[PDB]
Design an enzyme around this catalytic site. Sequence first.
Site, short mmCIF file in Angstrom:
data_model
loop_
_atom_site.label_atom_id
_atom_site.label_comp_id
_atom_site.label_asym_id
_atom_site.label_seq_id
_atom_site.Cartn_x
_atom_site.Cartn_y
_atom_site.Cartn_z
N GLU A 294 13.35 2.51 -4.90
CA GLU A 294 13.05 1.09 -5.00
C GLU A 294 13.99 0.25 -4.14
O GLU A 294 13.58 -0.78 -3.59
CB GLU A 294 13.12 0.61 -6.45
CG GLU A 294 12.17 1.33 -7.41
CD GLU A 294 10.76 1.44 -6.88
OE1 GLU A 294 10.28 0.49 -6.23
OE2 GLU A 294 10.13 2.49 -7.11
N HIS A 297 13.06 0.52 -0.45
CA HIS A 297 11.89 -0.30 -0.15
C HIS A 297 12.26 -1.67 0.42
O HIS A 297 11.44 -2.32 1.06
CB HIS A 297 11.05 -0.50 -1.41
CG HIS A 297 9.88 0.43 -1.53
ND1 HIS A 297 9.11 0.81 -0.45
CD2 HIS A 297 9.35 1.05 -2.61
CE1 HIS A 297 8.16 1.63 -0.86
NE2 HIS A 297 8.28 1.79 -2.16
N1 LIG Z 1 5.04 0.38 -5.35
C1 LIG Z 1 5.56 0.90 -6.56
C2 LIG Z 1 4.41 1.23 -7.50
N2 LIG Z 1 3.65 0.02 -7.77
C3 LIG Z 1 2.61 0.31 -8.71
C4 LIG Z 1 3.03 -0.16 -10.08
C5 LIG Z 1 1.96 -0.48 -11.11
C6 LIG Z 1 0.63 -0.91 -10.55
C7 LIG Z 1 0.21 -0.28 -9.23
C8 LIG Z 1 1.34 -0.34 -8.22
P1 LIG Z 1 6.53 2.40 -6.22
O1 LIG Z 1 5.87 3.38 -5.33
O2 LIG Z 1 7.83 2.14 -5.56
O3 LIG Z 1 6.89 3.19 -7.42
ZN LIG Z 2 7.37 3.07 -3.55
#
Ligand SMILES: N[C@@H](CNC1CCCCC1)P(=O)(O)O
Ligand SMILES: [Zn+2]
Length: 867
Positions: A294, A297
Amino acid sequence: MSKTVHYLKDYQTPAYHILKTDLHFDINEPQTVVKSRLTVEPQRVGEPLVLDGSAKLLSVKINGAAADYVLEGETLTIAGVPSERFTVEVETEILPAENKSLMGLYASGGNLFTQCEPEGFRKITFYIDRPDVMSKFTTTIVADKKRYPVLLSNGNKIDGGEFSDGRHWVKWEDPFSKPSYLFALVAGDLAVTEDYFTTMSGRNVKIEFYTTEADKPKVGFAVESLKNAMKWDETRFGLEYDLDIFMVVAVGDFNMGAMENKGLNIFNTKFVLADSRTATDTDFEGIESVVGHEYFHNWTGNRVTCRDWFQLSLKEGLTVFRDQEFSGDRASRAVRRIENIRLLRQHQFPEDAGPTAHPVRPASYEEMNNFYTMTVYEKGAEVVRMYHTLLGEEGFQKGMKLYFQRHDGQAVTCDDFRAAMADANGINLDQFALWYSQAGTPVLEAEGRLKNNIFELTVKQTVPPTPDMTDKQPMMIPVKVGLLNRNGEAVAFDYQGKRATEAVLLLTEAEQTFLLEGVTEAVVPSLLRGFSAPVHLNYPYSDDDLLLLLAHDSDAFTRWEAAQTLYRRAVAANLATLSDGVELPKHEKLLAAVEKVISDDLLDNAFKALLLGVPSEAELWDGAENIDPLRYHQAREALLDTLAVHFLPKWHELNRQAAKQENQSYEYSPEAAGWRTLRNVCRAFVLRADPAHIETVAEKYGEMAQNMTHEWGILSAVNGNESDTRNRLLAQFADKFSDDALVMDKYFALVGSSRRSDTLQQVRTALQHPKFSLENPNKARSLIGSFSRNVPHFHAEDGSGYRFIADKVIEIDRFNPQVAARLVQAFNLCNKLEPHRKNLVKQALQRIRAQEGLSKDVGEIVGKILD
Ligand SMILES: N[C@@H](CNC1CCCCC1)P(=O)(O)O
Ligand SMILES: [Zn+2]
């Protein structure tokens, strides 16, 4: 009918930009009112303003006056808008406590959280909710102070105050332009954990982790992992954080693992909370990976974001690769690389072979929530890793630098990342583009012959058709190779003017012959070292050749793959004998190999543990037609029984060895974790061969329960035991950790995953456990998800497993389509099953399909399987 399918080829720049996004949240009971003020910049003058939104609309204005508009579906359209700059003011109303989808603004534990990626922001207000639209957010929040003392949003807190009526307010300013999916808001009563990190430029970054009061003591490891990730990104990638504040918030109700919202990350509790008492070593490693992920990112996703959601792997593939390299640099690079490869082949390969197969960069989708997949993430990371293989670390970093130089503050595509890699190194990567557009696992057919002093390695490639695409052209596939003599020693060779002991053979055509010159002795080839490409390699190895590779090769993966092959061949032999109705095979050479592994004290404990792991049923029936999952289960179980009983005394001995070396160091560390991992493998075999041993363990359970890794390890080992003691230990486990939600997840996982005959009814009882909530994604996945992957029970001949899961898909889809759309993919094997089971699966999918109001999420998946 006409469904809405989104196509990449239809992409067009937005007719309007949003320069400024001023948000105001008035939190009350039960409703929260959101007032926005958008500064809109016309790109294509005259076009209607189209805003996405699904929240209750109270009013909308253009330049302060009541706007003439029409609301149709989840779109708000204003035809008459100014030719020049203007403002839009939208007023919406939300009832977060009724939001069980956990998307947009919702309630959890009495507090308020948000989840906006991919398209949840439109559930909050009416917005141009697409990631190529980037705006500078300023968020004001008003709420009752005693109920909501903590009010968070992206960026810097620049103002706030008190009201006489008990309410208070805050104002957050995020100076960095961002897409809507990176917006976040948190409101509630949370305990804070404070720390800091000083950047390379000498700037302090305030760190703040927000959790419940009770969970605060478990957040320590996450904080340390974050500080490590910040330092690592500085030293490895030269990337520095860009704010003086970084916030992390834990939430118990969350659809995935975590979310990288700018300066305000929101984490599933399972990827931030841990202590040795309640979390396994694997949980710790998970926290380290995701916390890192995270944060990484912030540059690969936030500073440079996605033009559209078809480009999802641009930030996810790259960021996964980054957290993998982070974890690898921390400790145990080799072992952790194998774990990643194993994950890919056990979960991504079945996807690429199944009805929902798609490219790393999809050409179309109905519901974007369905494409946060193993392919986009893990295979995506393998694609990124191949840049590193082709270019090397320095070359890779050159591409990274140019990538940021070109596109900082922009929303770009996979092509742009590839171009940055190509242009920064002056190399052609046109063919590499196929890794993004062509789905399916490539299959390599390799032939080897030593003639004269040349080892001629002929390699063919083909990629099977997928539901989205038939034509598959030859791809750029790097194959790292080596040679071993009869004594397993490294053999040198000459490749295109260089006498090394290893080389990357670049396969670019349908069929190529590689000439490894200067070989003065008989050799066995070591192929696809380090898993240099995400492919299926077929080479005619004898059993003895595999024994040699397993015993003397220098690359971790090839050693491991050799063991995997021997296991795979052994299961194939079991299938034959069980089918012919005769005695099981001897597996003479396999048992000899395992004995060598067990007794080899020079092997890393964690690597030894992997060598003693048998491929999953899914790996075993890969590329098979008319599958009876129970027959494959039977064959695998029979192999495990053989290994368990045959080496039972040595499983104890090895267990003893690992217990002594652990040295009562029960806290998490890569060192101690290795011994416990090995220890738990032994426990699994011991209790398979001698179930009655459970009573000896139960006798001294307390003495043995020195951390969760041990408790989990033993409960897992006995979870299939038909003894009453299994049920009692599970009950005691639930009683002991009843107050810890994350440990209760483990309990429900054990209930759902048991090989025991009565698992279905135990699961149905667990549905009514007071600590179970179907509306909680962690619990749903733990109990129901586990059951759906419980081969002997999910694929029960009477169809009870199919009907149960189908009921739960239907039930869950009524409030959380995302959990349901993930669950329904337990049926992905449908068309490859033997006639009886395939029929029952098709009935279940048709029943799910017949449901009125079935979500687009589940509907899309069901269509892929049935149609
Ligand atoms: N982008 C994040 C996940 N987001 C989801 C969370 C809940 C809904 C769909 C997107 P990540 O890959 O860093 O873990
Ligand atoms: Zn991610």
